[PDB]
Amino acid sequence: KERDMDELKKEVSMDDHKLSLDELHRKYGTDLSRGLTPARAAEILARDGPNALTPPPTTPEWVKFCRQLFGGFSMLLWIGAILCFLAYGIQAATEEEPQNDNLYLGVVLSAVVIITGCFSYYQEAKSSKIMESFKNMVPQQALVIRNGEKMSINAEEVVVGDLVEVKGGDRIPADLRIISANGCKVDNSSLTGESEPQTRSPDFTNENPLETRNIAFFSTNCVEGTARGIVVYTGDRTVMGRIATLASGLEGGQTPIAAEIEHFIHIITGVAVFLGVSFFILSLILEYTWLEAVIFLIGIIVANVPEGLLATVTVCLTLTAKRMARKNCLVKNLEAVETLGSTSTICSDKTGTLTQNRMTVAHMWSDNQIHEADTTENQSGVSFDKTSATWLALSRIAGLCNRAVFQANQENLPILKRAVAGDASESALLKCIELCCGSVKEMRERYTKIVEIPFNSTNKYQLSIHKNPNTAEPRHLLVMKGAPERILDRCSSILIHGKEQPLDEELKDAFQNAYLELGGLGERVLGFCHLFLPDEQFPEGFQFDTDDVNFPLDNLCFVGLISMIDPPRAAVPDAVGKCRSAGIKVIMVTGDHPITAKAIAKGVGIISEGNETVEDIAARLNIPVSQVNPRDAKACVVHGSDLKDMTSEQLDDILKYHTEIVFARTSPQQKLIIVEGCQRQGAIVAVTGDGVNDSPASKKADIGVAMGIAGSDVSKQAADMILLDDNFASIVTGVEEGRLIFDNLKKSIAYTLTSNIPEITPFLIFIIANIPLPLGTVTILCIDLGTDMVPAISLAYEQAESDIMKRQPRNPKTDKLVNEQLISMAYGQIGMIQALGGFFTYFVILAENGFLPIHLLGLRVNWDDRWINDVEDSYGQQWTYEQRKIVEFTCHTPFFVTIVVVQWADLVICKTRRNSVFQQGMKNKILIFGLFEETALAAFLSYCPGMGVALRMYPLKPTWWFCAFPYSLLIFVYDEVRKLIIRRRPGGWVEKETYY
Amino acid sequence: KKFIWNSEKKEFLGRTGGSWFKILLFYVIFYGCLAGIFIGTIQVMLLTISEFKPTYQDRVAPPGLTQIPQSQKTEISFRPNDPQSYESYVVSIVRFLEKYKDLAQKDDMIFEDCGNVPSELKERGEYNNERGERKVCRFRLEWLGNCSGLNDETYGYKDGKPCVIIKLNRVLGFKPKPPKNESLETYPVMKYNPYVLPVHCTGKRDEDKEKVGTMEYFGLGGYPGFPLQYYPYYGKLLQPKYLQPLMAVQFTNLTMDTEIRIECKAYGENIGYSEKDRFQGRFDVKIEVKS
Amino acid sequence: DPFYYDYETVRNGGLIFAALAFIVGLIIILSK
């Protein structure tokens, strides 16, 4: 019945906040000024549960180990091992002196799966381990009023329906219902995604419990001021709690890489059972009994399963994940490293992910000129002209008349990332003056503050009078700031390059259009002004007691405006440009106000310049919006207020006809609906978020990306990839590496899949032509799990053949990892030449030892017999059992060496899929070592003392080392001219048939 | 998604007809060239070997020692009464000695009467084809006394006290070298040490050596071995219908209804042994005449 | 006799090569 629970969680929350204080207190039975008695609080504490989210569902380590021992690839090797023991059972109990080949192979396959499980498990567990070192859960106590007394208790010890007081800086414990506020501004950034610090007013404002101001929220911090409130929701019943529980209860889906692995297995086992069944029927048609034919069936099918490809693919993914971890881009999932490359639509979060989520000084107005300040997090932008006197006056008005100062440990931290006490606006101004106008430390005390006038509830203004330390004038310096309309109403003089001028409308209207320029840009603007009081009328001893008119409200000297907003992160615009360059559709999904979301989208690249919305065209023609055609609007903004009353088909149409989309004022549940809508198109979706609202979106998306520091812990756990450095450019690195490793996997797979033809053809013609076995089991293991291991891994180190960030994202229904072209090359052409070369070495050895190839036909009937010790060759010589058997094993060993020689050229041609080996170049040092190690190991397996006794691999007469040479050169030349024709003829045949 | 069989826009099993023809034609030409290349290289390989001698002969360094009853496990278990119990043995003995009858060796142009006494080796020039088809020394069944007879189409062999002849593995250019007169304890044998390769049978342990009472050997002129006048071998091409020497061994005093192991070890300097191949040089048999 | 092959010489040489080629590969993946 959990379906209904998850459904009740996908619905947007409701509340009873809109209630009179008497109605609220009667519903909760709580005193508004004294809270409640401690006994009642303890009774509720032991009634419904402590105020804390239920811990995540613990995942035992043996469970995820067993998880790594299963899957799809390991499952194929498991059925292979089981088929080996089945064939062994059919061989042990039915025939005399049964061979232990199948048993050896079965336990080997089991060991392959187990070892791969241990390695992959250690990697995923290592990621989870370093992730556990990031839980810096510091206990936080709340201020609760109970029985009429102020008590500071643990957050979990807080209950429902009791008065709670919060001070500027304290984090809101539970979900409160504000009853009495005083300049209280809370930070709803991590929950609803509202950028600027939304104030909290006790009066009911909006029907939406999120946009309203009489509700404090879980995981939100009180920015400034103080407030009181009755606890309404506690623990998991909270807003962010109901969101977190939803994130834990959503499905992860199937990664694209895993789906490609499954499709690959479909083709592998398809041809495996086809060959096994057709050859089983053929063997029964010949002479072999059902007893032997069954072994032939299981043998041909099992032999067609790449035993070593599991470890090679796992190591490949692990290597790319290693590179991800080097750039502080951790991946909790070993296959999630690839999902970025296949992604075709990225749903980003504005506040926190795209933006820095911090008020920063944007632009300044000086001498009727707009000056853009540097808004980069690392300070790597253009610096404004900081030399004029107007800048000095403006900077003094901002640095002096502002209730903001640094804190205790703020000394070694940078100027921006450090902590500041006060309003977010005042903090931005303080950071700007401390970064561009020297230091505000001595600049503040240089002007002794006499009398201050803080901000006002109505007709907001902040002024103060300061002394003057300049050695040229003893007059008093009065400074004031506020909303541009208030300053325009209380000013007459205007500052320009040092001197003053009247309020002439020629430059005053020039100030008004600049005000609308910065305001329309989605920023918050503040006007700054100052004036010199006449020391003749206000002497150095006349204390301007704060009661009456001691300062001229009007006749002040306006210096300029100072705008501010949360700027996007440093490499965010460039990264978005790269994603759109790669063909990835960027869709901003945020619950912030549209007035800012549209501007940020224009500033990052989600809304291109020149593209208009339906409302933009309606405004450009001075006509109602119901007239213009939405098809004439490339981009569109979707208000969350309107998204609620929408169907699936409507959202589908929004995505299909609008290329640049910005979802604003969207609830976390609506973020989930948006991601599901993008997934209905059949595209790969990546969601990059930070707040708790991005938790249900990061969990359902094909790949979730969380911020390593600015991201909430819930969404950070529900994500599949973490950016420890918060560098959004890692998204670009990710899509690049994902496409790269995808192609490298294709190459590596084609390599291991090429060796299957010469591995199985000996046993096939052993049944057809009735000739001695050309290649044994152990020798095949020396190729699949021995030599070719390093070449396959080295194939992961291959670089880009062309610009991968220039091509469009891969089509999930078309560009598969293992297409029919790959099989047409490995199983069809290259592996065929390798098999012919192996048989060549076979006949070379047997003919040189006295068994001409023509004479080998029908010889296995007596060749494998252990007692016919007088088998006649072509020269009349009689060979005993062990003599000809020694020849057979010393015939399996060079066949294996032949596999290595042909794999030389096969590796070189698989290294490049389109470019000539001369174009790409043998610069892969791991590949060079892959050839040296492969060759040296192959020689060691033949010439080491005791190999014919342990592995039955006898030494090779040196001439054998040159039997396969022409076949290898042939493979290299054929594939080289193939890629040459694909280069010169990019049209049809060579590309659509062989290019994989 | 697995009904891509056909469509009204021409696709079969996944692709169109013209595409099926293009791919099939390509694969036929490609595989045809691959086959021609493999055939040409295998032809060069055939050109690197001669018709009168194998290039490598070291894998047959120690010659083997086989017997006439090619038993399933080198075991001779039968009943002295039931004629069908030992039919599988007698059939193989008659088929083996079918090429040694006096009528089979009748042409004087390919057969040469070696002699009634084992003599020195007979080298018929070099192994080239400059000389004609070499002659093969005759070997009549009369040499294997008590194990040849003058029986009819069916060689009435020994029911009690069976016969087991031994044969030396035919090797090209192999010249057997019997041990020097300084015989290092070689189990009583005749003084004809210079022109015959000795072969002596015995038990395997203190039990088998006791159960096997008396053994009687038969050979050319009565010597337990192979005469050097029949070596070396010049290949099947130059010496067809060649008859390698034979030597019979009869176990007279056996313990009926008891499986006993016999090891017939051939001695000589050019005769090697192997702990892995119980047939290289030596030879084993498990006789059990259960009545 | 032609029935003897110096397998120890070829074996020793094969191991010398299997050692040299491997140490050379190690030098290859260590560009210093």
Ligand SMILES: *[C@@H]1O[C@H](CO)[C@@H](O[C@@H]2O[C@H](CO)[C@@H](O)[C@H](O)[C@H]2NC(C)=O)[C@H](O)[C@H]1NC(C)=O
């Ligand atoms: C071959 O078998 C015959 C039996 O048919 C053996 O002839 C006997 O020989 C012993 C001496 O060992 C005489 O006492 C008997 O009178 C003989 N009997 C017959 C019927 O001839 C002969 O010895 C055997 N040959 C060998 C070499 O053992």
Ligand SMILES: *[C@@H]1O[C@H](CO)[C@@H](O[C@@H]2O[C@H](CO)[C@@H](O)[C@H](O)[C@H]2NC(C)=O)[C@H](O)[C@H]1NC(C)=O
């Ligand atoms: C052939 O073997 C038999 C044994 O099967 C020998 O005769 C036995 O001799 C022992 C004394 O050593 C007696 O206890 C047995 O009763 C005898 N058995 C029979 C059946 O006679 C016999 O001496 C052997 N003969 C030869 C020529 O080796």
Ligand SMILES: CC(C)CCC[C@@H](C)[C@H]1CC[C@H]2[C@@H]3CC=C4C[C@@H](O)CC[C@]4(C)[C@H]3CC[C@]12C
């Ligand atoms: C033991 C012997 C007789 C078996 C003979 C098997 C040969 C004839 C089979 C094995 C693999 C086969 C090929 C497998 C792959 C391709 C690509 C496919 O899209 C069309 C068929 C085509 C072109 C096949 C042609 C026939 C083929 C070469």
Ligand SMILES: CC(C)CCC[C@@H](C)[C@H]1CC[C@H]2[C@@H]3CC=C4C[C@@H](O)CC[C@]4(C)[C@H]3CC[C@]12C
């Ligand atoms: C195609 C070229 C550039 C690759 C270089 C690798 C070739 C030349 C190397 C790889 C392995 C080598 C062989 C390694 C083992 C043996 C046995 C030894 O006792 C004699 C040399 C001999 C017969 C070598 C001959 C040269 C050889 C075939």
Ligand SMILES: CC(C)CCC[C@@H](C)[C@H]1CC[C@H]2[C@@H]3CC=C4C[C@@H](O)CC[C@]4(C)[C@H]3CC[C@]12C
């Ligand atoms: C078009 C051209 C380049 C192809 C010419 C084919 C060459 C490269 C092939 C044809 C026959 C081949 C030889 C066939 C015979 C022998 C003897 C054998 O015991 C070892 C392999 C060895 C030594 C081969 C080496 C390579 C070889 C000479």
Ligand SMILES: C[C@]12CC[C@H](O)C[C@H]1CC[C@@H]1[C@@H]2CC[C@]2(C)[C@@](O)(c3ccoc3)CC[C@]12O
């Ligand atoms: C014992 C065996 C029994 C049948 C013949 O008497 C040949 C021998 C030796 C080769 C051996 C088969 C049994 C099946 C294998 C184990 C086989 O599945 C296989 C699986 C993987 O590679 C090969 C195909 C050939 C095989 O190796």
Ligand SMILES: *[C@@H]1O[C@H](CO)[C@@H](O)[C@H](O)[C@H]1NC(C)=O
């Ligand atoms: C071997 O020595 C014996 C005497 O010990 C002698 O009778 C015989 O003729 C010798 N044979 C050869 C070939 O020298």
Ligand SMILES: [Mg+2]
């Ligand atoms: Mg394999």
Ligand SMILES: [Mg+2]
């Ligand atoms: Mg956010």
Ligand code: NA
């Ligand atoms: Na997920």
